[model samples]
Target: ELIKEIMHIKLYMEGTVNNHHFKCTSEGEGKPYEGTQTMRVKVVEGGPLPFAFDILATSFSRTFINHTQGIPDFFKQSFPEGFTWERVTTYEDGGVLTATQDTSLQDGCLIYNVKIRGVNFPSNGPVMQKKTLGWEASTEKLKPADGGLEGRSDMALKLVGGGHLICNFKTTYRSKKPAKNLKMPGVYYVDHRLERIKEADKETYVELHEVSVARYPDL
Candidate 1:
């Protein structure tokens, strides 16, 4: 029932400053995937920082939702053909199988019990399996320039026998500007941005030093 309702679960991201580095392996899926997206931050006299270093940006975004039209150029390069969101399993509570898409049901639910893999879109591609370590979400008032409500989310995933992968995202929505993009009426302008990614308790290993915003117009 769980896999029947959902064709796939995609984790995708689109922003100017984004990076991802992770490694995963599974017995069922052969050939482990060790991925990396590095960003260089050199502190110019007037830049954000005063030194030069590499930061890891948030990677592993939900694919099915935002990437309906096409895959981003950067992703295509990293993933070749593309990527697929593998729906492994879900549960209601205490190992009880369930069929729902709620992200707030961690009380002995499947969200914490199941593990997912990101199969290279092509038939024969690398694999990325993830065991959800933890989840957290919050909201806050948007700045005057960034209209609408702001939602922030963070997730921790275990790479089977490897290090941990963390992905952070911030989404802003403004319904007042109904005509921002004709693709969706009620959804005026939406901005989904990735903040950063870290592995093995690193100090902001991957970060988007600049603000990279995604709007419907570009969708």
Candidate 2:
């Protein structure tokens, strides 16, 4: 087993619970979306929520852009009445990550008042949740979670009104030999959590754990 320095991946993530899934080639960089972000959610068995099995397809360039695109897919049938497409843009550099959330910090503090920022991961940041106080933040100070996975970080923020956005980022895969062509040297396996929280307690959470692999066959 060897470890390569750089990596490339096409995101494919899923949750065992409810079988909810999310897949995409990459996040768009504020330009016209080149790919599609396919997402789906279902009710947690015997959990507190409504029965739902809807698929959501939005452009890969996810950010405030999702708002100005049209009438607003946040209202689309596939999502809950107030479902926020909460995520972050992660760029791996030097075998580390610079995770960023593309929302206004002050805008999210409009109502929450006392202060606002949410849980982070890897180094010292925590993940996100709905019914737990840990997922809710009232302080302007951001707290990183306890992760044995060292070097990775998370970005979670409170939404403008009453919602929250959390990025569940985690991965570590390596390669031994340098690439023969242009493809990246190795693979990555990411394990994290993402929540579809609406109105505080009404939520459909997903715990993404398994994926086949992310390495290129040619490499």
Candidate 3:
């Protein structure tokens, strides 16, 4: 399941250019998740941050799969046949219900909602988040680099939101064009995001994201 999600997300960015932006939708019936996921990709001018790419993701929602009778083809292909998947559509916040499956729900599923707030974590702490990426911390706790997505294509959770996480990264390339504004290294932003899965023989699951667009320089 994890592998499926990562591969799906990665495919959304094949041969795309620096300024290209779009929404990634997936569905299991080969109709996995068909929602709007907005993305802003910028060519980063490298600095202390190892990553050269900066991306921001927001506005999330998903198609809930509700199991009925047999099994949804999407579920069958990803998992074993017996169980079906269903969309838990309605949710209530801070509300309690008699059954865990009650129509009234609080929060959503366990699937982590990830926003690649910024990429190419700079060594200079909070300062790096801006110069390389372009966004400043609205709150203090979202500052630290977790030192997580530096050199590998993996995922990590930002401290700001309980359900937020980032994935899929690579940091070895230099930018094709050098911007006069940048200081160190060549001219690209390192690529990194939350990897959908990690560590083999393990069971970790996150959902396909439904997102919104955020403000960007070229917006």
The candidate maximizing lDDT is: 1
- The per-model lDDT (C-alpha) reads 0.23, 0.22, 0.22
lDDT, candidate 1, at 8: 20
Worst 10 residues of 1 by lDDT: 26-35
Q: Indicate the residue-level lDDT of 184 in model 3.
A: 26
True lDDT of residue 74, candidate 2: 15
lDDT of 3 by residue, 46-84 (tens): 212222222322112122222222322221122221111
Decoy 1 TM-score against native: 0.20
lDDT of 2: 0.22
Give the TM-scores of the predictions, in the order they appear. 0.20, 0.23, 0.17
Cα displacement (angstroms), candidate 1, residue 162, comes to 6.6
Worst 10 residues of 2 by lDDT: 110-119
* Residue range 1-219, candidate 1, lDDT tens digits: 221112222112211111122321111100011111122221212222111111112222221122222322121122212222212211111111111111211222111111222212222211111232222222221222232234344433333356544434344333322323213222222233333333322221223312222223334
